[PDB]
Amino acid sequence: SYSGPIVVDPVTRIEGHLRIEVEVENGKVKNAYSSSTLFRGLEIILKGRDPRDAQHFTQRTCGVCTYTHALASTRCVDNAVGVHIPKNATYIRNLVLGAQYLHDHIVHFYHLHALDFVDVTAALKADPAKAAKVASSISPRKTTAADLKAVQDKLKTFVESGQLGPFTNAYFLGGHPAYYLDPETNLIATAHYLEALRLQVKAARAMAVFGAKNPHTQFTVVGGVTCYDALTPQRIAEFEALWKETKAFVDEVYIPDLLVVAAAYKDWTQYGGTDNFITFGEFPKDEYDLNSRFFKPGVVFKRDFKNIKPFDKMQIEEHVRHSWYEGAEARHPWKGQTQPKYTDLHGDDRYSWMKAPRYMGEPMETGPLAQVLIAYSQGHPKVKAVTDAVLAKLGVGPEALFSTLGRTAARGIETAVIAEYVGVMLQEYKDNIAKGDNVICAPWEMPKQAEGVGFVNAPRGGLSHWIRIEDGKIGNFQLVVPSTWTLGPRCDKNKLSPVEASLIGTPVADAKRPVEILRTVHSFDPCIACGVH
Amino acid sequence: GPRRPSVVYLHNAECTGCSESVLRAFEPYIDTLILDTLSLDYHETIMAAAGDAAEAALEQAVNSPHGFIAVVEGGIPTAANGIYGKVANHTMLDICSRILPKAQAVIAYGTCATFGGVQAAKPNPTGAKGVNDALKHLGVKAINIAGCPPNPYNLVGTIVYYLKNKAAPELDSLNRPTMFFGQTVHEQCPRLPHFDAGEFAPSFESEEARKGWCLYELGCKGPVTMNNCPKIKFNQTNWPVDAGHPCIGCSEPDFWDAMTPFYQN
Numbered sequence: 001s002y003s004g005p006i007v008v009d010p011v012t013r014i015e016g017h018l019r020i021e022v023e024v025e026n027g028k029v030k031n032a033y034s035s036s037t038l039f040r041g042l043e044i045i046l047k048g049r050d051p052r053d054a055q056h057f058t059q060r061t062c063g064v065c066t067y068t069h070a071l072a073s074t075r076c077v078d079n080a081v082g083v084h085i086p087k088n089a090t091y092i093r094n095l096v097l098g099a100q101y102l103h104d105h106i107v108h109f110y111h112l113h114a115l116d117f118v119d120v121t122a123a124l125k126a127d128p129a130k131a132a133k134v135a136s137s138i139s140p141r142k143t144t145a146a147d148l149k150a151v152q153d154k155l156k157t158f159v160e161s162g163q164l165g166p167f168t169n170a171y172f173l174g175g176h177p178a179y180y181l182d183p184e185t186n187l188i189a190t191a192h193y194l195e196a197l198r199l200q201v202k203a204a205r206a207m208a209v210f211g212a213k214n215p216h217t218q219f220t221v222v223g224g225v226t227c228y229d230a231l232t233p234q235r236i237a238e239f240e241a242l243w244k245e246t247k248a249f250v251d252e253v254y255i256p257d258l259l260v261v262a263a264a265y266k267d268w269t270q271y272g273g274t275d276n277f278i279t280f281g282e283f284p285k286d287e288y289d290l291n292s293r294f295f296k297p298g299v300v301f302k303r304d305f306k307n308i309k310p311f312d313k314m315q316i317e318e319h320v321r322h323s324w325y326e327g328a329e330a331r332h333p334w335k336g337q338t339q340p341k342y343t344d345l346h347g348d349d350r351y352s353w354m355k356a357p358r359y360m361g362e363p364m365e366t367g368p369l370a371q372v373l374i375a376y377s378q379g380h381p382k383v384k385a386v387t388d389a390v391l392a393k394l395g396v397g398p399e400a401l402f403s404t405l406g407r408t409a410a411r412g413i414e415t416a417v418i419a420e421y422v423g424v425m426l427q428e429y430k431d432n433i434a435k436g437d438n439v440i441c442a443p444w445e446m447p448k449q450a451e452g453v454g455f456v457n458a459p460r461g462g463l464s465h466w467i468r469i470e471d472g473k474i475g476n477f478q479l480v481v482p483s484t485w486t487l488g489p490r491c492d493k494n495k496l497s498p499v500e501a502s503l504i505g506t507p508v509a510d511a512k513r514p515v516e517i518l519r520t521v522h523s524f525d526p527c528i529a530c531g532v533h
Numbered sequence: 534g535p536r537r538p539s540v541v542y543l544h545n546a547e548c549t550g551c552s553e554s555v556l557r558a559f560e561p562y563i564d565t566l567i568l569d570t571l572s573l574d575y576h577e578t579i580m581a582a583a584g585d586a587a588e589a590a591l592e593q594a595v596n597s598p599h600g601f602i603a604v605v606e607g608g609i610p611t612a613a614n615g616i617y618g619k620v621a622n623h624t625m626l627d628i629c630s631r632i633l634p635k636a637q638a639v640i641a642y643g644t645c646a647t648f649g650g651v652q653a654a655k656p657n658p659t660g661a662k663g664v665n666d667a668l669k670h671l672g673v674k675a676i677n678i679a680g681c682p683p684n685p686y687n688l689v690g691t692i693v694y695y696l697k698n699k700a701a702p703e704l705d706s707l708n709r710p711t712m713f714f715g716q717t718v719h720e721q722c723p724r725l726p727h728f729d730a731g732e733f734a735p736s737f738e739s740e741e742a743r744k745g746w747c748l749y750e751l752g753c754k755g756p757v758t759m760n761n762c763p764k765i766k767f768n769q770t771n772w773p774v775d776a777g778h779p780c781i782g783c784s785e786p787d788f789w790d791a792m793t794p795f796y797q798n
């Protein structure tokens with residue numbers, strides 16, 4: 001078994017620029033470093049600007065989690081100016097966010113994660129008719145032998161060309177000891193990967209119906225939204241049709257594939273666990289009450305879900321001791337500072353452009369596993385029903401969720417729950433219009449001096465934007481992003497971040513093809529442009 | 534089938550919104566593009582290989598005797614000798630300096646790659662530059678497809694043109710293809726008759742906004758922005774002004790500083 005270093009740089013099939021470094025002994029990871037290797041400095045750029053402009057800049061934090069930062073900045077400035085936006089603005093903003101979750105998670109599972117589990121080339125060895133029978137046994141959607149043969153034939157022509165393209169040098173070429181699927185299952189997954197490339201077009205289009213375009217929506221303003229056309233029956237029906245098709249794909253393709261893959265990789269319940277969880281809640285009825293949200297906020301330490309703690313926004317501090325910034329001060333984001341000072345890898349004990357957020361001094365996982373586990377523990381009935389069904393189908397107990405497999409499963413669970421809830425929000429929105437409420441934006445006035453905060457639970461977890469308005473301008477604007485929490489470095493107490501801690505114990509069968517490291521890293525759905533900004 | 538042309542897709546200082554836009558390709562869709570039209574030989578967002586294996590894939594593509602097309606997303610950080618952005622522990626400046634002069638054609642895709650983009654906005658702490666600005670000393674001359682992100686119609690149309698003609702199409706004074714960037718957004722806008730009649734919405738909540746009046750007084754930059762948004766639309770369905778929001782000028786150089794405040798003219 002291998003002893004020595006492994007460096008993965010670039011980590012592909014994520015958003016942004018990540019270097020993972022591990023130390024391996026006797027075939028298992030004994031130490032890990034999460035190094036984010038691009039800085040842009042959006043917080044520096046925002047200083048002195050008009051608060052109304054912030055959302056346009058901060059949306060460009062990330063185009064994978066597009067919209068989310070526009071929404072967080074708009075919630076932040078809404079909050080700073082004290083505006084209570086109209087009910088329809090909350091509905092429209094919430095609907096676009098729900099659509100973002102569906103698009104993001106579908107693309108993550110297929111186009112970012114699945115190549116860690118699926119040997120696409122092995123699909124060429126499959127019997128398509130047998131594969132179709134398997135697919136049809138796991139989903140209410142019937143899959144035909146002929147449709148899987150069409151996929152296989154197309155792939156054969158592609159591979160036989162010798163130009164493997166995105167599969168060049170894949171860890172699965174020739175087989176790999178950590179890749180377990182049979183040819184038939186590889187063909188099903190490959191077919192659904194290709195199907196998802198077209199389905200995601202529809203899922204993204206749903207956002208543009210109300211939100212102008214995807215990527216980078218353009219319909220939010222302080223005080224509400226701008227899209228009068230979103231009130232029309234025609235636009236609503238267009239959104240509804242796209243949503244229905246997307247939901248059908250979630251329920252009939254994504255979730256069955258996730259469960260088949262999880263069942264084949266049940267050993268992955270034993271790696272990639274973490275201790276502490278934070279979540280901000282999402283889909284409000286009341287923009288000034290996080291506990292009015294469909295998912296509620298919460299904090300859990302040391303897997304103690306019987307004693308969920310209230311989220312206290314004043315207990316967030318961002319460390320820089322192991323980051324490429326000046327000094328070692330941990331700051332609350334309303335007193336944040338972004339002072340670059342590069343020292344190279346491990347120079348002065350620093351190794352990342354991400355800050356290290358800590359909550360009461362502790363490293364916190366955020367994202368789908370946090371949202372799902374905390375909501376379950378709060379008695380959320382939809383989360384409980386779906387989670388319990390998944391555990392029963394896999395034949396595992398709840399402890400299995402504290403793992404790379406569990407995290408991957410939670411992403412699907414949240415997708416299924418949100419897909420359903422989008423229909424509920426849509427009906428409430430329709431009902432509100434039917435009662436005569438056609439208002440979408442409220443007037444407001446800029447204070448010369450104010451503080452605000454906006455909270456979004458994005459597809460990767462708890463996002464917060466923090467403004468200090470001084471002389472009517474941006475005095476300070478700080479982003480604390482989900483991947484900052486999850487993939488940031490160590491803090492001044494030397495505590496490993498969630499991704500770093502999760503990697504300890506990972507087995508590595510072939511150090512030249514370290515897919516096990518990728519499985520766990522990818523399970524967090526890293527977003528490095530998000531994490532660093 | 535015939536050999537497909539090689540594409541090397543690079544990510545510098547970027548948000549990945551430009552990569553995401555390409556995934557929205559419609560007729561042809563992205564599967565047709567990567568299975569039939571092109572050979573996508575390096576792309577960090579979707580490629581199977583990681584780490585050393587990914588680096589090796591990049592080297593294999595760049596050194597092909599068939600040549601390659603480079604598509605570049607993101608600005609190049611140049612401050613402090615490029616250290617604000619690295620891939621495989623090489624600066625993005627160094628990577629692009631080595632690779633781009635070898636390409637048969639370079640397409641700078643998105644306002645960041647074309648003109649510097651969001652990270653180049655004042656005070657530009659990372660010294661970010663667009664491709665042509667950063668690499669002018671090396672004779673690199675990229676076709677600029679601007680927007681934040683651009684319309685993917687414009688990328689695919691440019692690639693198809695190049696594959697057919699082995700040359701860039703006619704370019705404007707910002708190196709953008711005139712077939713896509715030859716008209717202002719405004720001259721194509723459905724609200725133009727309102728602009729021309731002096732019928733402006735005074736606020737987003739106003740009845741004038743509800744009725745679709747012009748957004749100029751609320752900051753619309755359509756009159757000073759070159760793009761094909763009202764014609765092609767996005768996602769086969771919408772564009773900013775039809776969603777009631779002003780254009781922010783996102784296909785123009787330095788728009789972050791030139792077009793702000795966004796809600797003023």
Ligand code: SF4
Pocket residue numbers: 060063216546547548549550551606607642643644645646650651680681682683
């Ligand atoms: S041009 Fe805009 S969408 Fe594209 S990488 Fe730059 S910030 Fe992102």
Ligand code: SF4
Pocket residue numbers: 718719720722723724725726728746747748749753754755756774779780
């Ligand atoms: S809304 Fe903008 S692009 Fe349209 S007519 Fe008015 S100023 Fe021109």
Ligand code: F3S
Pocket residue numbers: 680681718758759760762772773774779780781782783784
């Ligand atoms: S903001 Fe950009 S997407 Fe078109 S409408 Fe204006 S050029």
Ligand SMILES: [Mg+2]
Pocket residue numbers: 043355478479480481532533
């Ligand atoms: Mg920050």
